[PDB]
Design an enzyme around this catalytic site. Structure first.
Site, PDB file in Angstrom:
ATOM      1  N   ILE A 221       0.859  -1.176   0.000  1.00  0.00           N
ATOM      2  CA  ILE A 221       0.000   0.000   0.000  1.00  0.00           C
ATOM      3  C   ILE A 221       0.896   1.227   0.000  1.00  0.00           C
ATOM      4  O   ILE A 221       1.804   1.338   0.834  1.00  0.00           O
ATOM      5  CB  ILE A 221      -0.931   0.009   1.226  1.00  0.00           C
ATOM      6  CG1 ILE A 221      -1.637  -1.342   1.397  1.00  0.00           C
ATOM      7  CG2 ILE A 221      -1.956   1.129   1.104  1.00  0.00           C
ATOM      8  CD1 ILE A 221      -2.154  -1.581   2.811  1.00  0.00           C
ATOM      9  N   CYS A 222       0.651   2.150  -0.925  1.00  0.00           N
ATOM     10  CA  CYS A 222       1.388   3.408  -0.977  1.00  0.00           C
ATOM     11  C   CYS A 222       0.448   4.534  -0.573  1.00  0.00           C
ATOM     12  O   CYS A 222      -0.418   4.939  -1.357  1.00  0.00           O
ATOM     13  CB  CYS A 222       1.973   3.668  -2.362  1.00  0.00           C
ATOM     14  SG  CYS A 222       2.875   5.231  -2.424  1.00  0.00           S
ATOM     15  N   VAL A 223       0.627   5.040   0.644  1.00  0.00           N
ATOM     16  CA  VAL A 223      -0.138   6.172   1.150  1.00  0.00           C
ATOM     17  C   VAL A 223       0.765   7.393   1.016  1.00  0.00           C
ATOM     18  O   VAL A 223       1.617   7.653   1.871  1.00  0.00           O
ATOM     19  CB  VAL A 223      -0.596   5.957   2.596  1.00  0.00           C
ATOM     20  CG1 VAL A 223      -1.509   7.093   3.032  1.00  0.00           C
ATOM     21  CG2 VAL A 223      -1.298   4.609   2.748  1.00  0.00           C
TER      22      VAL A 223
END
Ligand SMILES: O=[As]c1ccccc1
Ligand SMILES: [Cl-]
Lengths: 147, 150
Positions: A85-87
């Site tokens: 996940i790239c936040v």
């Protein structure tokens, strides 16, 4: 070190009073590998699904943000093919005092409100932009199959 | 005013929400009107707003739940996504809105935006521009108003 104790206290409180729709399974042996389940939020294509993820506290935590990985298969502009996940805003705004609780809530927020402009998964990002309703229908289908 | 049947479905949700609010968010339903919701968001640690209490009203709107509720900060604040009248503009919420998203979620995204501004959709252009071009003066201004008004 001191960080182990801080994480323990932060993880036990989080497990005992967890966010709505988020459940934390702490593992005593390894506190840098947090197991988490996020209920697919209502009113989203993920409604009714259970999404397992892990939060990796890196060697430099809390100076650096943790890394999150969905282990349940998902189709999302900000999730890699193996679940990373790239936040973006977490990476941009990270400060040591933000907390693990906030990290999990922001993942849930991104799950609901993708950022296709800076997508890890360009295919999912373009689909959200080029045919929103179809993106929702495909996300709903994968929630039914894998969630 | 809303249709009474919508007030009925909203009443249970707000009662549940008020009894078990998100961490750092206090929810005050009014004893009578259920189209207005008073909310206090605690200034998140690790941001320029730390230590402040930010009071807002959530207005459900005549077309609720077909359209999103609209949040307005009563507390003066310096934030790229809070307009002159306190309007909070959560652009992704308007993009992804559905009737079943729920009031809890709306408040959580307002808090998220408070922590993670979006200068691209800034209603306060000076705050969004200052945030990008000169962050220290942005944070200094946000801390100043947090101290004065929070
Ligand atoms: As709230 C939030 C954070 C990241 C991306 C979309 C929405
Ligand atoms: Cl990946």
């Amino acid at each position: 070190p001191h960080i182990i104790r801080l994480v323990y206290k932060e993880v036990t409180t989080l497990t005992a009073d967890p966010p709505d729709g988020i459940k934390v399974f702490p593992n005593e042996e390894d506190l840098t590998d947090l197991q988490v389940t996020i209920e697919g939020p209502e009113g989203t294509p993920y409604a009714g699904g259970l999404f397992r993820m892990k939060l990796l506290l890196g060697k430099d935590f809390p100076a650096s943000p943790p890394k999150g990985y969905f282990l349940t298969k998902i189709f999302h502009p900000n999730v890699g093919a193996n679940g990373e996940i790239c936040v973006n805003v977490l990476k941009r705004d990270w400060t040591a005092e933000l907390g693990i609780r906030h990290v999990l809530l922001t993942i849930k927020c991104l799950l609901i409100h993708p950022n296709p402009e800076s997508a890890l998964n360009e295919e999912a990002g373009r689909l959200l932009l080029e045919n929103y309703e179809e993106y929702a229908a495909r996300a709903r289908l994968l929630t039914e199959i894998h969630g």
